[PDB]
């Protein structure tokens, strides 16, 4: 019953077509209703429609006249219905169609030529039916068809005389997934005019039948091939033989429970560019296993190797120089595996490798020596992902071989050590270092001295020792733009900690114990660590137990755009504390103990605010405490989410629970 010029009447239990819909609509959506029929008359009014979606209904058959009533119809969706019988008239007059969806209609067989007048059809979908044959006509039609979906059917064999009807057709996708096919007739694929992508996913094949398939794909125009979950136990140099006569670029062999990959298995793929091998059971990756895959650019090995048997000590072995053939490999996804460790010549050869994901790729890579990543000496690696690898120690000069490294993720580990600074030696192109979620980091003065070009530093929940050093550990980080020090429960911080970080824009300091530093009773006075941060943009100071705020803490934060002081015990704020925040756009003070909001404090702050968040607060509902605040609320343009529901007063008890 809604209209965006696209009428959406979904889930309305309509037993008959609405007759009050505007004549401006071009798309009609009638999914999930109780329509028994679709009379042409009821659509005579809607002669300007271009898209009709009547999926999920109880429509038995269609009237031919209906197709005449919609001359501008491009997309016809008849999915999930009782449309079991098709005729030559049913889709005859819908010659302007481009998309036809016919999934889940319990169609046991398509008779003659119901699709002979669909010469403008691009995508034909017949998924989830009882089709035992790929034959859809007795002549050559559907010349402009690109995508044919016969997935999830009872199709057991592909024959030539059933497929040649697309001889003048150019198919980019032949979806035959979830089909128990057991035979490929000779010349059944050559019968197609143009075949670019074949999809035999979830299709019980085997090495031999796969070999036969590749044989029948020889000398074809195939570009994409999907054999996911085809139960391909093992591969040999004969398996993908026919593919020698193809210009195949993408191959998907995922979920095949692939146990053994024989030598020169993919030597017949010199044109292959994208290889998907994720989720498998490879026990031993031999040397010549990836022989002749020099044009491969993307390689996915996520969970491709067998898990640890613990008792049988069955760890997946990778021979040295197993990647030396992928000269043009650029993206390597080896995450989530049980590999023992990185051999001296593991990644030797990948002279174009730019991305390496080793997240949980190893059983236990507990120590990173200077000889660990020696196999990445001649690789132009830019992004290295070493999360979830149970790393406990990073020795000196460990990342020396990765001179071009930009992004290093060392988070999610057991890393507990002192940052000597020698860890980062060689990193002259480093941009961001992730260390979040670890054991402990004992900082020194020369911890980050060797990487002054670092711009993002993530130390979220890692326990910072000696962070209260007089020459800041962060001191050499001049170009540091983002600094995360949250969830570390830091109890002491010197004023000179952020000194030298003039380019710092984003600062995360939530969930620590910094309240003691902002009380006036603090021995030596309050700690003004935010002095000099001219280019500071986003500041997070939530969950610090703050109950006092010195008047001149945010005095030098001119470019400060966002400030988050939520989840604290704040109550009384000094006057003119936000007086210098001229670029302030977002103010957060939710879940506090604030009772009063006066002009002398929140005056200059509320000036150009676009987002204010003071949700859960025990407001004191008297004149001298809420007058100016309410007066500002009633006239402000500042977006204040959940203003009516979650803004309640506590005292006096008369206004207890009152907005």
């Amino acid at each position, epitope marked *: 019953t809604v209209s965006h010029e696209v009428a959406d009447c979904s889930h309305l239990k309509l037993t008959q077509v609405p007759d009050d819909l505007p004549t401006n609509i071009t798309v009609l959506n009638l999914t999930h209703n109780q329509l028994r029929r679709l009379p042409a008359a009821n659509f005579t009014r809607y002669s300007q429609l271009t898209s009709l979606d009547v999926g999920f209904n109880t429509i038995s058959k269609l009237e031919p006249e209906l197709c005449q009533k919609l001359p501008m119809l491009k997309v016809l969706n008849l999915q999930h219905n009782e449309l079991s019988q098709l005729s030559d008239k049913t889709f005859a007059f819908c010659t302007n169609l481009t998309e036809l969806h016919l999934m889940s209609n319990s169609i046991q067989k398509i008779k003659n030529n119901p699709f002979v007048k669909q010469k403008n059809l691009i995508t034909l979908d017949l998924s989830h039916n009882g089709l035992s044959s790929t034959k859809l006509g007795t002549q050559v039609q559907l010349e402009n068809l690109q995508e044919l979906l016969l997935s999830n059917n009872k199709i057991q064999a592909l024959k030539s005389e059933e497929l040649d009807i697309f001889a003048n057709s150019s198919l980019k996708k032949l979806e035959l997934s979830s089909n128990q096919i057991k035979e490929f007739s000779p010349g059944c694929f050559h019968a197609i005019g143009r075949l670019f992508g074949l999809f035999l996913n979830n299709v019980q094949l085997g090495p031999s039948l796969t070999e036969k398939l590749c044989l029948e794909l020889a000398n074809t125009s195939i570009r994409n091939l999907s054999l996911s979950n085809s139960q391909l136990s093992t591969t040999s140099n004969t398996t993908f033989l026919g593919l020698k006569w193809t210009n195949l670029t993408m191959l998907d062999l995922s979920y095949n429970n692939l146990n053994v990959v024989g030598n020169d298995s993919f030597a017949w793929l010199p044109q292959l560019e994208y290889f998907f091998l994720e989720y498998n059971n490879i026990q031993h990756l031999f040397s010549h296993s990836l022989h002749g895959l020099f044009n491969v650019r993307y390689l996915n090995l996520k969970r491709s190797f067998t898990k640890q048997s613990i008792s049988l000590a069955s760890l997946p072995k990778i021979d040295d120089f197993s990647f030396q053939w992928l000269k043009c490999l650029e993206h390597l996804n080896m995450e989530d595996n049980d590999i023992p460790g990185i051999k001296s010549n593991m990644f030797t050869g990948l002279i174009n490798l730019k991305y390496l994901s080793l997240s949980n790729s190893f059983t236990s890579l507990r120590t990173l020596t200077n000889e660990t990543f020696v196999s990445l000496a001649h690789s132009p690696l830019h992004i290295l992902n070493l999360t979830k690898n149970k790393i406990s120690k990073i020795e000196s000069d460990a990342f020396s071989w990765l001179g071009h490294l930009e992004v290093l993720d060392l988070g999610l580990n*057991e890393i507990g050590q002192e940052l000597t600074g020698q860890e980062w030696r060689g990193l002259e192109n480093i941009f961001e270092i992730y260390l979040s*979620y670890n054991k402990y980091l004992q900082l020194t003065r020369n911890s980050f001295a060797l990487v002054p070009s670092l711009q993002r530093l993530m130390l979220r929940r890692v326990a910072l020792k000696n962070v209260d050093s007089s020459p800041s550990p962060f001191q050499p980080l001049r170009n540091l733009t983002i600094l995360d020090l949250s969830n570390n*429960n830091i109890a002491n911080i010197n004023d000179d900690m952020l000194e030298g970080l003039e380019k710092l824009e984003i600062l995360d300091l939530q969930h620590n114990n910094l309240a*003691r530093l902002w009380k006036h009773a603090n021995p030596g006075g309050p700690i003004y660590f935010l002095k000099g941060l001219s280019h500071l943009h986003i500041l997070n100071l939530e*969950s*610090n*137990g703050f109950d006092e705020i010195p008047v001149e803490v945010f005095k030098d934060l001119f470019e400060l755009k966002i400030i988050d002081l939520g989840l604290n015990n704040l109550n009384t704020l000094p006057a003119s504390v936000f007086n210098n925040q001229v670029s302030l756009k977002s103010l957060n003070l939710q879940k506090n103990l604030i009772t009063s909001v006066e002009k002398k404090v929140f005056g200059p702050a509320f000036r150009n605010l676009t987002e204010l968040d003071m949700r859960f607060n025990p407001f004191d509902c008297t004149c001298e405490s809420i007058a100016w605040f309410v007066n500002w609320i009633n006239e402000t343009h500042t977006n204040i989410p959940e203003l009516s529901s979650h803004y309640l007063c506590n005292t006096p008890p008369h206004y207890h629970g009152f907005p």
Partner: antibody
Amino acid sequence: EVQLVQSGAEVKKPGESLKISCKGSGYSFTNYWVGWVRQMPGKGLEWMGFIDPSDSYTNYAPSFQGQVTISADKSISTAYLQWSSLKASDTAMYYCARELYQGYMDTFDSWGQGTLVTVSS
Amino acid sequence: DIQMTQSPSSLSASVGDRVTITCRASQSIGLYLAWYQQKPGKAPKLLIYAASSLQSGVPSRFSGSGSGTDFTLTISSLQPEDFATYYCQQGNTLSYTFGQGTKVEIKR
């Protein structure tokens, strides 16, 4: 076995100094962190803080900040928890536990039997 | 400043039943949550870490699930010695916090 043994229960007067012990045995004491948990009779578990036996690095919960002192002797492999001035509200049961970093978070596998500190006049 | 709230505070269950205890966090704590069992008068015991991982030596009937702000401890078949007080803990912040606990009692 990885075993944590604390001292016997303590009964003192308000304003007196106290120092309870937690001795570890069976494992390398300076390898894992040692945490303290206070539970008052009837109430739930509370986090006090933790210490690294090697460098005696201490980290307290915001509430227990300066309200208690976590120390440790590497020789005896014994982490102590002491108060300069006991109060009435400190009447509770005190556990110490070994922090094991598994699943990328600190968890306490082995615990002490607990030391009951009852403070009244 | 993360507040862990468990539910229910106390429940009555017969031996053999399948029991579920819910655990909520003030803000998202990821997958860093631990279930501890506590017998009356005795020292606590680590049941589950990393929300879903099973600690070595802990019965197989004990499972843990959930993420973000919602977690759930599940006992497949309750045992006569499985009647205790269950606490949940978050490890996303170094300022660890426990729940108020869930007391398991015998239904009669």
